[PDB]
Design a protein around this ligand. Structure first.
Ligand SMILES: NC[C@@H]1O[C@H](O[C@H]2[C@@H](O)[C@H](O[C@@H]3[C@@H](O)[C@H](N)C[C@H](N)[C@H]3O[C@H]3O[C@H](CN)[C@@H](O)[C@H](O)[C@H]3N)O[C@@H]2CO)[C@H](N)[C@@H](O)[C@@H]1O
Ligand SMILES: NC[C@@H]1O[C@H](O[C@H]2[C@@H](O)[C@H](O[C@@H]3[C@@H](O)[C@H](N)C[C@H](N)[C@H]3O[C@H]3O[C@H](CN)[C@@H](O)[C@H](O)[C@H]3N)O[C@@H]2CO)[C@H](N)[C@@H](O)[C@@H]1O
Ligand SMILES: NC[C@@H]1O[C@H](O[C@H]2[C@@H](O)[C@H](O[C@@H]3[C@@H](O)[C@H](N)C[C@H](N)[C@H]3O[C@H]3O[C@H](CN)[C@@H](O)[C@H](O)[C@H]3N)O[C@@H]2CO)[C@H](N)[C@@H](O)[C@@H]1O
Lengths: 273, 273, 273
């Protein structure tokens, strides 16, 4: 096993408090909360309770309740069914590190569990609808994957070592897990092909509906099906500066002391050129 | 707060009856039903009970039950988790008016809550899969939105007034909310860009998968990514007639007395040309 | 009524055992399990219990539990909310036969209930995100379908027989239900138009995001919006051999005795040319 998003938060911030469950629990959540005292949330006080909304619909009910004016996000509450949500600290998602202020949808965390990704960067914004799938094998008479359920030991072996010896890397085998940089935007209905992409450059923008079939260089704004660059983010000199200064690894104080360097693209250039 | 779809229906049609809950309640639903007598649905009689299916899967179970032969849609039953469903009367959806016989999916109601839309017309058919998102800011060194969580008062102010002064209207700021006309069809996997669209013309057809990036004139059938017209609905003289006669604002009696004007496009033209 | 996926499995494999419910039941599931003894799963033994995970999230919890090491898929457990999941035997899905090792998502089973499909083949792999919708009527002044809710008997009749007399087959009327062959791959965000497609050839590959608007001949690899062939699977002589040998109708013993005929495309050709 390994820790879920909620478990990681509770480790940090629960601080011996009781867990006030806001919503109908699921068996998975009840396994998580088994070591703690917990109860169906009634009257709640952040000094004594940490509130776990089960679903995002359960969260909206809580935040509409006057009782939640005192609760601070992450420190005092969290949604349980939200493994790919943003956090103010670096977290883990099935041995995939993801930085701060970084969210994604069920498709991506799904890809994380499969191991299609090695890391997601900082301040990265991925739409819920986006999907990341590998490709099936093209070298054989079949493309069905679940035919593998019918194979014995002997058929499994001969099938499983033909996949390992493949250039086009089916099922994301034989390749490095994908790497998604910081300050990336991925739009709705998008697709990144895990069998052929190894890295998405920092600050790259994927237009919505676009279908990425190969690595996107840093700051390449890409649309259309498949994905070709229509515009770059900034000048190539500005690109190479951002990759050394690494403002996304900054502290919070460094963000609020160099605000207007971030707000103005070329005001930044004077300071870190 | 403001009234949900269910609350609006119950106001109209509950008429002092008890609410028979068909399904496992959610905390959000239980907040809604708090003022009324309600119970886990067992034997139900529309003379005494109004049946609220919690989920759409709960609804199918009810409609398969022989007990539901006597219940009429809206008047006697409704799904709770169905904020974007059709209704025989004009309704509200987060201060967004939507006409009669008009449905949409979770993406659109999501856009409604954000305020990306000003109104949805009558007899409008929007696929569940469709999504409506704004664009992030392109004028800065970053595109991440949730970096805003790290800003203090002072950083928030300088960041928030640069957005207000923007031509491309990021986050749907500084622009009129979108307006969706009557008799519109939007297909599956579609996308309308809330940062750049202000109005979708009445009777416009969005082909599925199409990505609308700018206003669609009335009756423009549009496909492809992005969205360009491949065909118009009717002749331009027929277009300008429909915009004055406004058959979608008709009564029910006017629909059933002028049936074959609606069924035949050019039979309509003789009456209202 | 007709039998769901779970009911069909339980008929085959329950064998007088008790149903151990792993998760929060739904009213629909509780209707299914009404004839059997069943209980909230605690300590479970496949000799005495069949475990029904309600949701797929409930399933992952079960499979992470050490108690599930003894349970075999289908024979001893199954997800309830998974009507379009793979099975080792041919099954039914709303009078739509689907072969072995064949899965699809909520869109397709949705299309099945509508009757847009006549059969799904063997070893067919359809992404969850794929959608299958018919087209609305284009012959009239309106495209809204739910305006039909406002029609009386008389308006319904004149409206319903104009649809039956249509070349473009709106609402999948007047046409054969769609047929999906064996060994088909359909990718994410895809769309097959039920109003214009009658058959997808065996072994056809639909690239993800592609929008199929007309029949795909066997083994045509198709991408882009709309869907045009960029490559065929195998040589046209190999195509016509696979359609007679029909390896997807094989037994399991025939799969494991002719493994390397399936793994190697042209090694197959020597045996069955
Ligand atoms: N507020 C509407 C809510 O949105 C939900 O999720 C969708 C979307 O809104 C939601 O928004 C995501 C959240 O996830 C995540 N927790 C924080 C992130 N900043 C936010 O960002 C997203 O929505 C922001 C609106 N602040 C937009 O500014 C931003 O453009 C967009 N990327 O992510 C989903 C993407 O598709 C549900 N769709 C809807 O039912 C619900 O009501
Ligand atoms: N009947 C199948 C059901 O469909 C559900 O939702 C999908 C679709 O079917 C459903 O259908 C919508 C409903 O929403 C809404 N309440 C009324 C509207 N007339 C209807 O319309 C939609 O389905 C009609 C089939 N009358 C089609 O005639 C019409 O082309 C299509 N726009 O909207 C969703 C769009 O994607 C679930 N996908 C599936 O699980 C369920 O079983
Ligand atoms: N393992 C991740 C899980 O995936 C889920 O569903 C998605 C996907 O993964 C899932 O996978 C389907 C299953 O359905 C179905 N029961 C068996 C089938 N062999 C499998 O196949 C799919 O995932 C396989 C990963 N073996 C891939 O090898 C294969 O390329 C892909 N078609 O189908 C969905 C397609 O979109 C959820 N998205 C996620 O929450 C969950 O955690």
């Amino acid at each position: 096993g390994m820790k879920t998003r909620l478990e990681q938060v509770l480790e940090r911030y629960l601080n011996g408090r009781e867990v006030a469950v806001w919503g109908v629990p699921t068996r998975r959540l009840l396994r998580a909360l088994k070591p703690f005292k917990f109860h169906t949330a009634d009257r709640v006080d952040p000094q004594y309770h940490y509130v776990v909304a089960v679903t995002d619909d359960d969260l909206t009910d809580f935040l509409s309740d006057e009782q939640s004016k005192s609760f601070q996000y992450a420190n005092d509450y969290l949604t349980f069914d939200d493994e790919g949500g943003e956090l103010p600290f670096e977290r883990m998602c099935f041995n995939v590190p993801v930085g701060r202020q970084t969210y994604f949808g069920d498709g991506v965390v799904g890809a994380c569990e499969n191991g299609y990704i090695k890391s997601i960067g900082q301040f990265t914004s991925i739409n819920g609808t986006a999907e990341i799938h590998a490709n099936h094998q093209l070298n054989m008479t079949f493309v069905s994957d679940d035919i593998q359920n019918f194979f014995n030991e002997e058929s499994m072996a001969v099938f499983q070592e033909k996949l390992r010896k493949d250039p086009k890397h089916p099922y994301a085998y034989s390749k490095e897990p994908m790497t998604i940089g910081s300050d990336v935007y991925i739009g709705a209905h998008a697709f990144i092909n895990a069998s052929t992409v190894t890295s998405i450059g920092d600050g790259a923008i994927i237009g919505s509906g676009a279908v990425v079939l190969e690595n996107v260089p840093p700051f390449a704004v890409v649309v259309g099906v498949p994905a070709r660059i229509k515009r770059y983010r900034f000048s190539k000199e500005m690109i190479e500066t951002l990759l050394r200064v690494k403002w996304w690894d900054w502290s919070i104080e460094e963000i609020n002391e160099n605000v207007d360097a971030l707000i103005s693209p070329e005001l930044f250039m004077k300071k870190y050129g």
